[PDB]
Design a protein around this ligand. Structure first.
Ligand SMILES: Nc1ncnc2c1ncn2[C@@H]1O[C@H](COP(=O)(O)OP(=O)(O)OP(O)(O)=S)[C@@H](O)[C@H]1O
Ligand SMILES: [Mg+2]
Ligand SMILES: [Zn+2]
Lengths: 49, 628
């Protein structure tokens, strides 16, 4: 689908924003391992230190 | 005089009889003797022990049993029953002297002792009060509906003269009528005297509306109500909505020019409460040791889950989700910037007749602070915060709603699918940032709404569809479905064996409920749950990391295989949050691998049950290791 087809609003609204980001679901093993490690770091308290 | 001479009366009425000074001092002497010498033939004086206890705890209340006074001094019990005001004043002076003998400096500290008569024999309902009960002692049952704020009432009134400026000595204030002053003793004038509240001493005052309990009311009739006046030590003892027994003097209100609407000289009546008796998550030191003893057992989690909702049969997964929601996790603010929610949100999506309402009621009885709200009905606390003006008082109040009121607690929402837009925005904000922002009537503020949410909903059309997935089965949009940690889909598939035990359970409840006819007991479980929420705060260590990243990577790619809705980071955080509630049931400061595996099982089972029938059969074989 188009980026304007994915949004549930008018495409002219997109023009009013200076920077638009399209955040992607990578669906990769090595990225999932790293992000899981990061979240467990946050929950453990190693991230705070 | 003597007791037999006290029984004989010379005055016109009993009030003027007790009013006589010789009779009054005889009554005071006999009451002092009775307070001193009374025993139950066990070698112990109960009233001496009561005086010592109230002296040691610095109390102004002496609880005196009516049966003890009745068996020993029957004429004094009759005098207390029929003319209670002056009798209670005399025996208050008697008890004050008795406390003075025990403690000499108690008088300067307190200077007042209130005697609470207990176990009055006759019990009246509110509908059977007549004028014969006026100015007499009455014991009535009732449910408290509303109570006023505590107000200062004048007790030792001090005046000042406007001509001289001197402060004139204190006078005791009768609670029945206003007192006034006409002489100065310094100016020898009747000039204008003003009350100064700086030197005046006050007592607490409260008004409580008491109605007849609806069970005792006859069918066609309406419940009668009375106003009960609570004095200094008795204020704020009765929460509205609870049923109590009040003993007090039944008396008339005095109002100017009576009632002009009726056309008859009609008086309003009140109960001046001598005593309040009620028909708490505090643990002792022994209860903590018993909690450690029962938490040392290996099957503590199984036993807690089995103790969840005894009236509910066969719904073990729901009971597990309720146990996680009641125990809760640890909310964590890492380095201030990043915040992670630490309470479990459970959504029970089920067909009608699956006993979700009974589960919500059980959580309400069980949890410390549980607020019940409904989308469809009206007689409940609203979910939206508001600022409202009372149509009578003309005074504005800010109410946070059910979500703010359940802060550090539980919000139980029945009929989740039937909300309007404003409620949907309110619960969306509460599950998003755990706060409620209000900008109304000049008030701009944010209220804390860190409340765990347990909700009950029905599928579209009244029946759940297995071929359709979870998003199509509810009107709930995907972001509000994502905020829930546990998603319990319940369908009553017709199995003859299950229906047999369910029907047997219902019929056995019906038979035992007839008037003519392993689990932790709930009182202990309630305090165990409260202790775990405030004492444990479980944590996990860094070497347990290599497994959770292992399973989560094995999670997501399987969601890639079938094309279902994805496993996000919220599922990992739900795993790590539910595991911190399993370690709270064990009362353990660390999170073990078994609690983590059980949390993985709960999250995976909630994820698979939410799938369509095609996705579910593929997902069950791949995650059979985690589900076991
Ligand atoms: N597993 C069960 N164990 C015990 N009682 C049950 C069970 N399932 C249903 N019931 C009974 O069935 C009745 C269902 O009443 P409610 O729980 O009030 O209705 P509901 O389940 O909330 O569904 P609604 O209100 O129609 S959406 C109650 O009398 C329950 O006691
Ligand atoms: Mg219901
Ligand atoms: Zn004066």
């Amino acid at each position: 689908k188009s980026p304007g087809d994915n949004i549930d609003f008018q495409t002219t609204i997109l023009s009013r924003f200076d920077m638009i980001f399209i955040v992607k679901d990578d669906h990769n093993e090595e990225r999932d391992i790293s992000i899981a490690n990061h979240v467990i770091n946050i929950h453990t308290g190693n991230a705070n230190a | 005089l003597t007791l037999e001479s006290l029984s004989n009366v010379k005055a016109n009425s009993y009030s003027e009889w007790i009013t006589q000074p010789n009779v009054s001092r005889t009554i005071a002497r006999e009451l002092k003797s009775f307070l001193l010498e009374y025993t139950d033939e066990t070698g112990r004086s109960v009233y001496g022990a009561r005086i010592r206890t109230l002296g040691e705890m610095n109390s102004e209340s002496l609880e005196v049993n009516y049966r003890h006074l009745a068996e020993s001094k029957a004429i004094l019990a009759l005098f207390l029953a029929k003319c209670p005001e002056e009798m209670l004043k005399i025996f208050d002076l008697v008890a004050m002297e008795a406390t003075e003998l025990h403690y000499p400096d108690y008088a300067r500290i307190h200077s007042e002792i209130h005697v609470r008569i207990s176990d009055f024999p006759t019990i009246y309902s509110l509908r059977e009060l007549r004028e014969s009960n006026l100015s007499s002692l009455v014991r009535v049952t009732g449910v408290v509906t509303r109570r006023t704020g505590v107000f200062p009432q004048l007790k030792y009134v001090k005046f000042n003269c406007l001509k001289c400026g001197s402060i004139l000595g204190p006078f005791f204030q009768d609670s029945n009528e206003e007192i006034r002053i006409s002489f100065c003793t310094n100016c020898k004038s009747k000039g204008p005297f003003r009350v100064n509240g700086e030197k005046t001493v006050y007592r607490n005052y409260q008004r409580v509306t008491l109605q007849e309990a609806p069970g005792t009311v006859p069918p066609g009739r309406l419940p009668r109500h009375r106003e009960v006046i609570l004095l200094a030590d008795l204020v704020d003892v009765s929460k509205p909505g609870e049923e109590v027994e009040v003993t007090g003097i039944y008396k008339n209100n005095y109002d100017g020019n009576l009632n002009a609407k009726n056309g008859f000289p009609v008086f309003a009546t009140i109960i001046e409460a001598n005593s309040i008796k009620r028909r708490v998550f505090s643990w002792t030191e022994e209860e903590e040791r018993e909690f450690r003893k029962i938490s040392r057992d290996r099957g503590i989690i199984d036993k807690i889950i089995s103790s969840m909702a005894p009236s509910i049969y066969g719904h073990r997964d729901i009971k597990t989700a309720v146990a996680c929601s009641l125990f809760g996790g640890v909310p964590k603010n890492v380095n201030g910037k990043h915040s992670i929610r630490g309470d479990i949100n459970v959504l029970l999506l089920g067909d009608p007749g699956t006993a979700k309402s009974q589960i919500l009621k059980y959580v309400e009885k069980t949890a410390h602070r549980a607020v019940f709200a409904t989308g469809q009905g009206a007689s409940a606390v609203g979910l939206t915060a508001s600022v409202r003006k009372d149509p009578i008082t003309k005074e504005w109040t800010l109410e946070g709603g059910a979500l703010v009121l359940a802060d550090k607690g539980v919000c139980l929402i029945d009929e989740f699918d039937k909300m309007n837009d404003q409620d949907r925005t309110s619960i969306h904000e509460a599950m998003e940032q755990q706060s409620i922002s209000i900008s109304k009537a000049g008030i701009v503020t944010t209220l804390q709404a860190r409340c765990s949410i347990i909700a009950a909903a029905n599928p579209n059309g009244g029946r759940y569809n297995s071929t359709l997935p979870l998003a199509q089965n509810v009107s709930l949009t995907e972001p509000i479905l994502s905020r829930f940690d546990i998603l319990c889909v319940v369908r009553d598939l017709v199995d003859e064996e299950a229906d047999e035990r369910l029907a047997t359970f219902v019929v056995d409840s019906h038979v035992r409920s007839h008037p003519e006819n392993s689990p932790i007991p709930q009182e202990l479980l309630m305090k165990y749950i409260h202790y775990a929420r405030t004492k444990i705060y479980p944590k996990l260590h860094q070497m347990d990391m290599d497994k959770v990243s292992r399973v989560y990577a094995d999670l997501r790619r399987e969601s890639i295989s079938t094309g279902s809705f994805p496993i996000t980071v919220r599922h990992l955080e739900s795993i790590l949050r539910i595991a911190e509630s399993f370690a709270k049931m064990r009362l353990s400061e660390f999170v073990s691998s078994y609690d983590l595996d059980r949390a993985i099982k709960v999250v995976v089972d909630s994820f698979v049950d939410a799938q369509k029938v095609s996705v579910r059969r593929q997902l069950r074989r791949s995650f059979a290791i985690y589900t076991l």
